[PDB]
Design a protein around this ligand. Structure first.
Ligand SMILES: O=P(O)(O)C(O)(Cc1cnc2ccccn12)P(=O)(O)O
Ligand SMILES: O=P(O)(O)C(O)(Cc1cnc2ccccn12)P(=O)(O)O
Ligand SMILES: [Mg+2]
Ligand SMILES: [Mg+2]
Ligand SMILES: [Mg+2]
Ligand SMILES: [Mg+2]
Ligand SMILES: [Mg+2]
Ligand SMILES: [Mg+2]
Lengths: 367, 367
C-alpha cells in the first residue's frame, strides 16, 4: 500500500514539474522527454527506504494527538499528512538522486542499480549530466514550494532540508579529501598524490561517514516525517539523533563491505573502492590491526586496477579476518540501537516503532 | 505403470517387516495388527511424489544415457533397478511418515490428509505415537538392509540417506525455534515468545525451508534415483542441488500459502500456522513489506487460538496484496528453475527430463 500511495504522488510530482517546465519555461516536448526520462532513471529503481520512512513515520505519529483541532478524528488530516509525507519522501529521493548523479561522475563509477550511471548513458554528456544533477536538486524545491506554500511548516521543513543538504556536501569533501594528507591540502599546490595512508583512521572514517550518509539517510527522513506530522517536539532529538548516526554509520560500513565482498550482480555497481583508494571501513579497520608486514603489502597493492593487486587486497582483508571484525561491529551497533530505541518507546512509542521498522530494513541488508 | 509396481512393493516390504517382527522379535498378532495399521495409516494416502520420482529417475536413467556396465538392452537390470528404485522410494516415503508422525504432535495438528493425525487416534496414545514414529524410521533401515544386502551401493545409499535424515531434524530445529529470540535461547530459563518478531526475516525463512523440506522432498528422491541406476557421477551435482534447493523452497512456500488460503477440504486439514504462529512465508513477506501500523496489529493477533484475531491476520495478508508477491515469486522460481534444467539437460538429458517431471508436478500444485 505505501509504495502504492508513494508512487501515486511520484506521478503527480513528475506531471507538475514537466508541465510547469512546458507552460512557464518555454520547453519543447523533446527536452521534456529528456527530463522525464532523466528523472525516472535517476529517481526510480531503488528501495525508497528514505522516502518510505517519512511516510511510515508520519502515518505512525498520526494516531496520537492527530494534530488536534476541534474535530472527533477526521480522515482529512490522515490524508493531508500522507500526501505531504509522500512529497517530503520524494524531496529526499530527488536529493539522493542528485548526489548519486554527481557522485558517480566523482567516484567515476561505471554502473549503478545494474544500469549505467546517468552520465554514462550513450546519449548523455558529462557536462549535461552535471547539470541534470543540479536540476534534480532544484526539483525538490519546486515541489516543496508547489505543495507546501500553504503549510505553516514550510520555513522549518526547508531549513532542515537544506542544512542536511549542506551536511552531505561537507561529508563529500571529507570523503573526497581522505586520500591526501590534510597539511598539504592546497589548491595552488601541485598534485599531491596518495602517499602515506595516515588519516585513514577510524576516527577520520566515522566523520566522513556521519555527514555524507547518516544525516540524509537516517536523520532527515525521520525528521521530515515528524514535521509533516507536527509532532517534531513530541520526540527526544538526542536519542533520535543518536540512532540515525548509529544506523547511518552501520549502513555505510555495510555498503563499504558489500562493495568488496558482494557480487556486482547482487550489488549492481562493480566494486572498485579499493582501486579508487577509498577510505573504506575495511581499509581503516585493516591498517589498525594489520602487522607491520601486512600494512606494507597493502600500500604496494592498494588503489590499483591490476587484476593481481586488488585480489591481494582482498587477501589481506580476508587474511586479517575483516569479515569477522564486521560481525562484531554489527552486533555492538545492534545492542546499542536497541537500547536507544527503547529509551524512545517510553515517551515516543508510536515514533519508536517506525525507527524499529527502519532498523529492520537496515539490519538485513545484503541486497 | 509406476504406481502399479510401486504399490506391490509396499506389500512386499510390509510382508517382510511384519514377518521379521513375528518370527524374530517375538511379536503377537495383536501388535502386528497394530503396527500394520500404523504403517498403512501413516505411509499411505499421499501422492508418493518422493517415492515416484526415484522411480522416474530410475526408468529415465536406465534409458537415456544408461549404464555401460548393464548388458545390451535386456530385462534383467530393469527389474533390479526399478525394484530398488521402489524400495528406495518407500524408504523416503517411510522417512516422511516418521517425520510427519512426530511433526503433527510437535506442531500440534488435529488432522492430516483428510484424516486425524496418528496421535489423534482413538487407541493411539500420544506416548505410543512418539515410538511409532521412531519405528517408522527404523523400518527404513530394515527394508534397506534386507533388500540392498548384496547391493554394492548399500553403504552409499544409507550414508547419503542419513545425511538428509540428519538435515531434516536440523531443519525441524530451525522451524520450531523461530518463535523466540535466538540470543535468549538457553534451556535453563523460561522461553517466552518474541514480541518484535525480529527473527522473521526472508533470509531466516529461507534457511528453515532449505533444510527442513528441500533436501528430503527434492534432493533425496533425485539422488536415490541416481544411486540406484549408478548414474550419479554422470550429472552435475552443483546444478542438481540448485534446483532441489530451488524447487524445495518453492514447495514449502506453496505449502505455507495453501495453509492460510486453501480450504481445509481441498487442503486436507485445518490451517495451523497462524495459531501456531510459525515463521511461514506469508508472515515473513508481510512483515517485510508492511508498515509500522500494519505490523503492530498483526503483532496483536498472530499466534492465537481465537478466530476473530485469526481473521485479521488473514485480512491484512490479502489486503496487503500477498497473492501478488506469491505469483511474482512463482515466476522467478519458474524462470530460474527453467534455466538450470537445460543446464542439467546438457551433459545429461535423461536426468533432466526426469527432473522436469518433478518440476512438472510442482509448478501446478493445486492439491
Ligand atoms: O556510490 P556509492 O553508493 O557506492 C556511495 O556509498 C555513495 C554515497 C554515500 N553517501 C553519499 C553522499 C553523497 C553522494 C553519494 N554518496 P560512495 O560515497 O562510496 O560512492
Ligand atoms: O504439518 P505440515 O505437513 O503442514 C509441515 O509442512 C510439515 C513438514 C514439512 N517439512 C517437514 C520436515 C520434517 C518434519 C515435518 N515437516 P510444517 O513444517 O508446516 O509443520
Ligand atoms: Mg560512488
Ligand atoms: Mg563517493
Ligand atoms: Mg560505496
Ligand atoms: Mg512442523
Ligand atoms: Mg506441522
Ligand atoms: Mg504447512
Amino acid at each position: 500500500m505505501p509504495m502504492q500511495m508513494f508512487m501515486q504522488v511520484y506521478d503527480e510530482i513528475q506531471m507538475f514539474l514537466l508541465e510547469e517546465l512546458e507552460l512557464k519555461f518555454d520547453m519543447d516536448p523533446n527536452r521534456v522527454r529528456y527530463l522525464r526520462k532523466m528523472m525516472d532513471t535517476t529517481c526510480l529503481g531503488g528501495k525508497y527506504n528514505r522516502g518510505l520512512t517519512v511516510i511510515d513515520v508520519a502515518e505512525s505519529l498520526l494516531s496520537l494527538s492527530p494534530n488536534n483541532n476541534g474535530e472527533e478524528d477526521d480522515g482529512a488530516r490522515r490524508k493531508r499528512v500522507l500526501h505531504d509525507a509522500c512529497v517530503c519522501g520524494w524531496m529526499i529521493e530527488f536529493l539522493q538522486a542528485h548526489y548519486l548523479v554527481e557522485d558517480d561522475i566523482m567516484d567515476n563509477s561505471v554502473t549503478r542499480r545494474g544500469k549505467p550511471c546517468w552520465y554514462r548513458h550513450p546519449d548523455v554528456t558529462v557536462q549535461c549530466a552535471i547539470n541534470d544533477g543540479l536540476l534534480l536538486k532544484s526539483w525538490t524545491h519546486m515541489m516543496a514550494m508547489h505543495f507546501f506554500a500553504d503549510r505553516p511548516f514550510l520555513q522549518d521543513l526547508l531549513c532542515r532540508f537544506n542544512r542536511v543538504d549542506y551536511t552531505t556536501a561537507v561529508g563529500q569533501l571529507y570523503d573526497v579529501t581522505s586520500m591526501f594528507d590534510s597539511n598539504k591540502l592546497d589548491p595552488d599546490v601541485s598534485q599531491p598524490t596518495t602517499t602515506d595512508f595516515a588519516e585513514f583512521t577510524l576516527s577520520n572514517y566515522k566523520r566522513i561517514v556521519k555527514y555524507k550518509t547518516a544525516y540524509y539517510t537516517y536523520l532527515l527522513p525521520l525528521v521530515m516525517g515528524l514535521i509533516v506530522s507536527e509532532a517534531l517536539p513530541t520526540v527526544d532529538m538526542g536519542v533520535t539523533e543518536e540512532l540515525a548516526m548509529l544506523m547511518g554509520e552501520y549502513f555505510q560500513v555495510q555498503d563499504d563491505v558489500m562493495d568488496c565482498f558482494t557480487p556486482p550482480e547482487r550489488l549492481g555497481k562493480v566494486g572498485t573502492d579499493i582501486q579508487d583508494a577509498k577510505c573504506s571501513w575495511l581499509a581503516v579497520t585493516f591498517l589498525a590491526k594489520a602487522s607491520s608486514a601486512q600494512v606494507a603489502e597493502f600500500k604496494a597493492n592498494y588503489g590499483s586496477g591490476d587484476s593481481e593487486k586488488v585480489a591481494t587486497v582482498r587477501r589481506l582483508y580476508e587474511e586479517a579476518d575483516l569479515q569477522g571484525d564486521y560481525v562484531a561491529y554489527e552486533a555492538a551497533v545492534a545492542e546499542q540501537v536497541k537500547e536507544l530505541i527503547e529509551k524512545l518507546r517510553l515517551c515516543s512509542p508510536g515514533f519508536a516503532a517506525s525507527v524499529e521498522t527502519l532498523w529492520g530494513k537496515t539490519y538485513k541488508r545484503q541486497k
